[PDB]
Amino acid sequence: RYYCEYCHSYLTHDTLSVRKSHLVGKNHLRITADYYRNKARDIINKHNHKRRHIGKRGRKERENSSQNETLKVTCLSNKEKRHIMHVKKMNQKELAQTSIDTLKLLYDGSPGYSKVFVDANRFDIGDLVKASKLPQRANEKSAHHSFKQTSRSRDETCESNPFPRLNNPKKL
Amino acid sequence: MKLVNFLKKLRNEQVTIELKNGTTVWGTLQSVSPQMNAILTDVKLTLPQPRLNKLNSNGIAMASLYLTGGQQPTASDNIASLQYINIRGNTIRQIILPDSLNLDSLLVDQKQLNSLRRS
Amino acid sequence: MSTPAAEQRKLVEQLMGLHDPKICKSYLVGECPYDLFQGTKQSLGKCPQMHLTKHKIQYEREVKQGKTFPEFEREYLAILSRFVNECNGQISVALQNLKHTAEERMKIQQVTEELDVLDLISKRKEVAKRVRNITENVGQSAQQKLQVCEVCGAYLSRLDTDRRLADHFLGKIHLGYVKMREDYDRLMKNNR
Amino acid sequence: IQVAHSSRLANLIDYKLRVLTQDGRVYIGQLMAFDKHMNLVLNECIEERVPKTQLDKLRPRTTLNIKVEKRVLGLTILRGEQILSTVVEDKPLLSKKERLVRDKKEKKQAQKQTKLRKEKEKK
Amino acid sequence: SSQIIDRPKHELSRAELEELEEFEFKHGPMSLINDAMVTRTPVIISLRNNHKIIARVKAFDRHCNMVLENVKELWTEKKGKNVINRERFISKLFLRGDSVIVVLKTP
Amino acid sequence: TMNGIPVKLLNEAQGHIVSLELTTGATYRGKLVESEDSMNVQLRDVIATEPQGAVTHMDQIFVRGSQIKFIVVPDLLKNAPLFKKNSSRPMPP
RNA sequence: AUACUUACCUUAAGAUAUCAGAGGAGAGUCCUACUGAUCAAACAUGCGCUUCCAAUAGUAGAAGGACGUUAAGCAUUUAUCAUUGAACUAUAAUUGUUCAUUGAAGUCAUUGAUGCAAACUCCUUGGUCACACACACAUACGGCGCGGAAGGCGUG
RNA sequence: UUGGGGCCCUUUGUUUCUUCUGCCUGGAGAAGUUUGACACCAAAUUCAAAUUGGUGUUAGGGGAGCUGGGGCCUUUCAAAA
RNA sequence: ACUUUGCUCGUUCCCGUUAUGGGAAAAAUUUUGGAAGGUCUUGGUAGGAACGGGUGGAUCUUAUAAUUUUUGAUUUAU
RNA sequence: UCUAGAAAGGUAUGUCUAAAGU
């Protein structure tokens, strides 16, 4: 038999046609994505500090740092540090998620634009994007959204949009 | 008969395993796996110089014998001395048995004797 | 089997007159119907006549250049015709089951009460009550919405997209039974 | 380092083995799995080799110094046809007593997990 | 006899497996090594690494790995026109059988 | 039969960038589409290093399983569930 | 959560330490909360057993790295062939030599690669424990403090 | 209960067993400790709110009771000289 | 070896007597095994015992010495 | 000649039906 360690559900006689259909099951994909998000979150969130090996301080060090002065230490209440840690975690996540993307917005009318920046007509990763689009065997998945697709073809030329300013542009 | 069940009975005996490369391993034998995966405790790996002036040793086995890491460096010949090597089974060419063992009690196959007697 | 040379031995040994009951002539023509439905849920069991590859490639040679044996065609047509007429009976049973749902008693009395409730501005009131009765018939449809796949006889639906239909139409059942219908259409055109 | 005399490869999990292979290469990495075919899974292995040029320095006649090519490979699995010997190098990060504490704690957590899963699916 | 040779080996049962092994040793190609184990004649084995050995056979196996005794290894080596003949005497020895080429039986 | 932790780990890395060196010396590195039970892998959009160094590019490749020397999966599969020693499977069917 | 539709699939066999004795069940098998010995595992518990555990009476030190810098360091060594033209040493598929056409394929690197040696910087790891600032030793050295890590050996 | 001295506070989210309150002129107060409690990740319903699915945390030190084992001693009993 | 009769040496005690015998303990003591208790030192302290599995995982045996790992094309050699 | 009763599940999939306010 087979046992999906992430899923926690058994299965009957392990045939590759059953197993491969399980491994692209939507519910298995949700369980696996939760598992790996939580494990990466646990290894980020785990502050393991070095063990402390305290040596006995000497005399002249003790005179110098007993004759410097004493500094005040600041500390906060419980709700303050909880609110601050929520702020710090969302700021680290938006730095990890964002990316500068102005070279894509800035060449938006250029002549060979659809052959490089479209990301579906690229010659290196061109076939992969079309290949991994997914079946969408759900009618209501396509029936949810009612906007336009805006598929820019690879066959586009320099002639269309001859004057870029007159078609209404946006300032950066 | 399967003759690895003879090798399982030799425990804590010094052997001198010839490998397929040419390097020989000399140490206290231990639990031998059923596919002849020998585990040796206190080994003295060595690689014999060919004892002709013009000839070459094995190059692959020489680099392997250094990259065990425990090669005692200042010595002249390729001798590495380490503890606990775990030799994979399909690489042992021949095993030089100790001399003192009594073959006439070791080579009695218990399972063959049982299968001849019970049938 | 377990070691791959065992399975390879199995294949070469089944590779190594040509008449009588020993050889399934229906497989020999091609696509034995007890072979196309081995593992599925419409499984007939095992093909009674044995199947063998040396005989099959000898038949490939014979119908390549030598001759054709029409007794094989009439035997295959008999087995094909009895299976196709049996599954025509079964799709008749399936649409009978849709009818028997459609002429259910309490649903007919409910639609009869709503159709007595259907009884200028009289036409506007009648059309509003008849659109309510049309939505009652469509509520009975929203309980089911079943059409019948005309080849295999299994149920289908139209609210579902083309892609889950494409998931159905590349089946073992539906491809096997399409192959049966196509050899039946070919032999009934050719014999007539 | 000293390894126990009766310690097969099933017992040396999370040690830092030094797996020799058929080519003179050596994969110094932390072991974490193995198999019937003896094809390990090394965690942080560093595939070394002695080059064709410096191999004359190992030829039999201060000390000798060899410059090897450390090439970092993260979480390899090996193919067991290639392996030639395994030698232990370093002990684990944890002790034995600490691994005992952590193993009892993991088994306790698994039994609580299955208890909650069973009593949730009965509800 | 015929019933165990003709069938594939996965259709035999356990008593027929052991009977087949006894048949393969007693009436077969390894009957050479078995006759030399009983009759105490020295064998000459040509290993795959161009070492020839000469010994007596205490036991053998289905893989042709064998426990020898009074082993006399004989190999030749050369680098160019310089060439010597070498000899090594080993008392008791286990030969892993995947290296053998031709077991011979001395007249 | 049973596969054990390495071949099952290789099946856990279907979809991600792996880097494998054959026994002839070559090094292929791409997205791993379908591995199999005998470590027989496919690789899509690969960057193929020949043994003397000449790197080329090729769309898909199917190595024989027997020629692989190692396979370098991503780092996060250290935390894969099959490495958990004390596991509590619920119930057989 | 419930329900229906459709797809895919339905399990290699045997065993759980050995030897030996005693007893029994219609020559062999099977069994004994039967009996001895051997092996193995766990748990305890021990050895004058072996190895290792970082200055403050000071600004140090050990083991391991650097996929760190000086650094284009110092010394060497490489950078495609053909068909022809003009000349050309020349057994070759005009090879050698300068210039060009045409033709095969053609990882990048030449601040590279290979060899050699040093200096500086930065990481990770631990008992930074307790007592003491002392005159020991041929059977060479009270190994006669509390622990911790790893191995050896013995018993229950 | 108070006062003084030494050492540590990197315990960096100022004791890290959790929640709430709280602090460097201080080292504190309450509540809780496994058919549970708590922290967090994901998603769709168009803020939060809610449910469903996952990953974790639930600690360290000392003391009375009962108990497994070892060493020494005393008393008794059976056996060997 | 049992058995009896007297002599001699002798562990301890008594008696005829401190020559030496008679009687008793067949002893004082040492070792091994068991119970009780003293004290020291180390560990555990919420789950454990019996039974049932068309129960999971390990290990072994056999298919398995025939192209995918373990019964050889990596000592570069003619 | 020695008495034939085939499983009953698992995962994947869409659709229906439904449960929510401020």
Ligand SMILES: [Zn+2]
């Ligand atoms: Zn799953």
Ligand SMILES: [Zn+2]
């Ligand atoms: Zn047929």
Ligand SMILES: [Zn+2]
């Ligand atoms: Zn259909």
